[PDB]
Paper text:
Our first computational method (design method 1) started with docking structured cyclic-peptide scaffolds onto SHA and re-designing the residues in the interface to improve binding. Tens of thousands of conformers were generated for each of the 100 peptides, their energies were evaluated, and those designs for which the designed target structure had the lowest energy were selected for downstream analysis. From the previous pool, five peptides with the greatest in silico predicted affinities were tested for [name] inhibition in vitro, the best of which (des1.1.0) demonstrated an IC50 value of 289 nM. The crystal structure of this design in complex with [name] revealed two distinct binding modes and peptide conformations in the three protein chains of the asymmetric unit, suggesting flexibility of the peptide as well as presence of iso-energetic binding conformations. In two of the protein chains of the asymmetric unit (chains B and C), the peptide conformation was very similar to the design model, but the observed binding mode to [name] differed from that of the design model. This binding orientation interacts with several water molecules through backbone-mediated hydrogen bonds. Rosetta-guided mutational scanning successfully stabilized the binding mode observed in the crystal structure (confirmed by structures of variants Lys4→Glu and Pro3→hydroxy-Pro) but failed to significantly improve affinity or selectivity.
To address this challenge, we develop a computational “anchor extension” methodology for targeting protein interfaces by extending a peptide chain around a non-canonical amino acid residue anchor. To test our approach using a well characterized model system, we design cyclic peptides that inhibit histone deacetylases 2 and 6 ([name] and HDAC6) with enhanced potency compared to the original anchor (IC50 values of 9.1 and 4.4 nM for the best binders compared to 5.4 and 0.6 µM for the anchor, respectively). SHA can coordinate to the zinc ion in the active site of HDACs. In all the crystal structures we obtained, the thiol functional group of SHA coordinates the catalytic Zn2+ ion with a Zn2+– S separation of 2.3 Å in a distorted tetrahedral geometry reminiscent of that observed for the inhibitor Largazole.
Author numbering:
A (entry chain D): 500 to 507
B (entry chain A): 7 to 378
Write the structure that this text describes.
Amino acid sequence: XNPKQXWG
Amino acid sequence: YSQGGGKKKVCYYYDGDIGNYYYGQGHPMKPHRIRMTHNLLLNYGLYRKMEIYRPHKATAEEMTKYHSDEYIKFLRSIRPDNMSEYSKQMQRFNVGEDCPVFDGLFEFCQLSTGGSVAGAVKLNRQQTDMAVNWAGGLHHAKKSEASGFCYVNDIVLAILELLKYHQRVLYIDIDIHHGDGVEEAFYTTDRVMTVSFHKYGEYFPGTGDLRDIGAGKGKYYAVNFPMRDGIDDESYGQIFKPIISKVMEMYQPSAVVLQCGADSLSGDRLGCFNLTVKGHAKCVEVVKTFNLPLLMLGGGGYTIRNVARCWTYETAVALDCEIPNELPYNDYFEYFGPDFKLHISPSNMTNQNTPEYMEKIKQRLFENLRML
Ligand code: NA
Ligand code: NA
Ligand SMILES: [Zn+2]
């Protein structure tokens, strides 16, 4: 979900 | 008996402890937004027109009605001080990254799912029209896995409670993400129909294609409307009411669950849509006019100053109570700067959803709706 960090 | 529908009775669920739960440093999911929403409701005097309840902490036995014992017992035991011992088990249940481990995490799941199951038995007992639980709406949770900031799926648990007295339940998901956890739990049954409007294509959670209509007995009972960036109010409104009414006509449920994900508003921290509060709340008006046992739930929303605006107005919409645009004073009046007004205005971004694209997806879904 978070595009700031990760893939979600 | 006679008549149709007039003014509705609403039951609101809220716990004061829900605002102090903290996901993590810089984490976008802030449970504090629920307390902002509740505080804004009180200052609008809407507590005079509704019955406010406090949800119980849903026990592990109620959660295992859908989840597995391995995943529930893990959530009861995992704490920020003993994460290293559960390092392997954190990765199996997707607990760590988007779903971090913080203090009182299991109690936060108990409050969220508590309001949804309490509102479910309240509807089953025919003691209200709409049950509101803005602490719920967590739709990404799996049977033995967490995802998309969701740990325990309150929606699936609340729907399983409705199935004890309702042979057909309709689930509507206006969150900018696809309700993949709710859709997957009832993907192979006709007793629950899942409808989700979401942004598709290089976006969480990656599922939600309109070609996923169900399997087994639940074929043609999974409706998805893929969307693009920057959809506005007129584009969302031209397709919501006709699609919802066609579902109400062909499926004809006896209970409705409307997940009001606020991350589909304009200028969201994680979203990319361009909906306003009036455009978002119009979805509640359409579902409300059908006069069915409704269960309104929360969900997404990461520009918290707007989340308090949306779920407050949508609550007044449930109460049929007009509220002034001038925001009264509240404990968090500083968040709503620099306007200090209830409703918001769209952004200047381009609507990637052409009106011809909106009509084609609508007509493609009407084909699957005729198959009932
Ligand atoms: Na959705
Ligand atoms: Na289904
Ligand atoms: Zn979302």
